[PDB]
Amino acid sequence: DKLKVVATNSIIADMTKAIAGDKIDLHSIVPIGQDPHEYEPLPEDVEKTSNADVIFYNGINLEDGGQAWFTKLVKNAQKTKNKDYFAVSDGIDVIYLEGASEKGKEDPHAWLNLENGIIYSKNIAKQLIAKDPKNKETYEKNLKAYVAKLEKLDKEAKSKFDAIAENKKLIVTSEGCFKYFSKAYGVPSAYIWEINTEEEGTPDQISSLIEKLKVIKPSALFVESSVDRRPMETVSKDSGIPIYSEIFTDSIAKKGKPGDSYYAMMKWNLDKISEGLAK
Amino acid sequence: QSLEESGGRLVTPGTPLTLTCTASGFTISRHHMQWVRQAPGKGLEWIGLIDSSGSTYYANWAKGRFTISRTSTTVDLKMTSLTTEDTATYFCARGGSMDFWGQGTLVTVSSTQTPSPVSAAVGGTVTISCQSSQSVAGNNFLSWYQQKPGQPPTQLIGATSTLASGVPSRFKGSGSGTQFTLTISDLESDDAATYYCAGGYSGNIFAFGGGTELE
Ligand SMILES: [Zn+2]
């Protein structure tokens, strides 16, 4: 009988594929392209969750809020934390949402720091080995290869942006999801709205970023695969700074497209963001 | 904040027709949308849903005669060949729990879950609307809806025990697996409505029970 695994988003699901391979039955709740903060699970997701031998969720205020979907899911399914479902973010230095609006809440976009993605993967393989010790061999060899593949990319991101002047190191995305990236890789970031729970693209939010750009003008703006592009397109039209590239934050790309995995989305993000900020 | 259906009209059998659910005050790109019909006098019947990502699921009787598509602002229901038995009011409802519904558009064509009772009645006390399902649902995907006549359904309880915003604890939902129960205490004059029930199943199929009118 195959181990039944449920991941909450395509990032976590892809991390689990990289470790488990063909040895598990994997279900991803939030489909590719959809927002993982406010996605509403479907009956098939409730069913596969209740029959899951292990569930992996992000935690740190992505889906585990008080009135959030995952908390309702595991409560209604009567699952126990650290026995059935596990937060793959356990063990990272948390960064909180600065906005006085989101008082005290945590920023969930930890995977944008590659070292946290390694922590995510280590937490995934830890529980896969504990519940399916038959395949401890394969989980460890895939984790070891995955961690190394991510470490090389991490060492690359540490010096990817050294050629760009400090007055032009600004990653501008629609959502303020780059906090862990900025801390880890020395590139400040700006946004329209801080988290997808807020209203996305108000005239004040747009006009504030317009003024922010006048002070620190980057060569390029960016837009996420999982957000409506019209807010960032208004900022781009008004500021005159073109959006250099689509980037990947809260979701991987569809099967077949560039960035259709966590590693590929990070290499894509490093490639495109370094390219755009140059000119 | 609002859903508005359009396109319904009176047609002959075999006439194709397309209905449109237009959203006002929010975007559809991040909500599941269901199409539900209700024949005159008869009860609520689920047709299908379009998942926010784009997947489509339909009832087993659709036979491919009803097709759902979505844009950033509208959801389409393309009926390819209408029969007189398709005479109904066609609603769109948002979300997996069908939180809020449109007013409905009327289509006239011209020339499973069983609630044990059809009716129940008290003055100011307590009534029970019960539910038997053929198969288990996820064990908790059951929802209760109140439908005052000539109005869209209002959702009362989602997930079988969880109240919706602004519904009193007076409405109590219980049950698990196949048997579910809606209990209404402190009965009021405007509790008079036909209380329906909707379950979600494996394969993302939804089904309403028959009515349970209340006095
Ligand atoms: Zn996000």
Strand ranges across the sheet with B2-6: B2-6, B17-24, B74-79, B66-70
Q: Residue B144: CB partners within 8 Å, gap ≥ 6?
A: B129, B155, B156, B157, B171, B173, B182, B195, B196, B197
| Residues in a beta bridge with B64 | none
Domain for residue B16, yes or no? yes
Question: Which residue type is seen at B150?
Answer: G
Per-chain residues with Cβ under 5 A from ion ligand 1: A 177, 196, 250
Rounded Cα gap, residues A77 and B137, in angstroms: 12
Beta strands in chain A (DSSP E): 3-7, 24-28, 54-57, 85-87, 171-172, 189-190, 221-224, 243-247
Rounded Cα gap, residues A85 and A146, in angstroms: 22
The number of residues in chain A equals 279
Determination method here? X-ray
* Structural domains in chain B (count): 2
Tokens representing residue B36 in the block? 């539900």
Q: How deeply is A92 buried, as exposed, middle or buried, from its count of CB atoms within 10 A (0-12, 13-18, 19+)? A: buried
Query: Is A233 assigned to a binding site?
Result: no
Helix (H) or strand (E) holding B38: strand B33-38
Domain with CATH 3.40.50.1980 in chain A: 3-149, 159-278
Rounded Cα gap, residues A195 and A109, in angstroms: 10
Exposure string for B65-98, b = 16+ CB within 10 A, e = fewer: bbbbebeeebbbbebeebeeebbbbbbbbbbbbb
Reported CATH class of domain A3-149:
alpha beta
This PDB structure is determined at a resolution in Å of 2.8
Give the distance (Å) from ligand 1 centre to CA of residue B165. 25
- Whether residue B179 contacts residue B192, with contact meaning beta carbons closer than 8 Å, is answered with no
Angle between helices A114-131 and A10-20 (to 10 degrees): 60
Point out the domain boundary residue: B77, B109, B141.
B109
Task: Quote the minimal CA–CA distance from A154 to chain B in Å.
Answer: 32
Q: Which of 73-112 (B) contact A at CB < 8 A?
A: 95-97
- B158 touching chain A per CB within 8 A: no
Q: By C-alpha distance, which of B91, B149, B111 is closest to B10?
A: B111
Q: Using a CB cutoff of 8 Å and minimum separation of 24, what contacts does A9-12 make?
A: A9/A36, A9/A58, A9/A62, A9/A63, A9/A250, A9/A251, A10/A251, A10/A252, A11/A58, A11/A111, A11/A250, A11/A251, A11/A252, A11/A262, A11/A265, A12/A56, A12/A57, A12/A58, A12/A88, A12/A120, A12/A124
Rounded Cα gap, residues A257 and A44, in angstroms: 26
Helix (H) or strand (E) holding B201: strand B194-201
Task: Round to the nearest angstrom and report the end-to-end CA distance of chain B.
Answer: 30
Residue B188: strand, helix, or coil: coil
Instruction: For Cα atoms A98, A104, A106, give the angle at the middle one, nearest 5 degrees.
Output: 75
The listed CATH number (3.40.1190.20, 3.40.50.300, 3.40.50.1980, 3.30.1300.10) that belongs to domain A159-278: 3.40.50.1980
- Whether residue B23 contacts residue B16, with contact meaning beta carbons closer than 8 Å, is answered with no
Q: Please write down the HEC assignment for all residues of B50-113.
A: ECCCCCEEECCCCCCCEEEEECCCEEEEEECCCCHHHCEEEEEEECCCCCCECCCEEEEECCCE
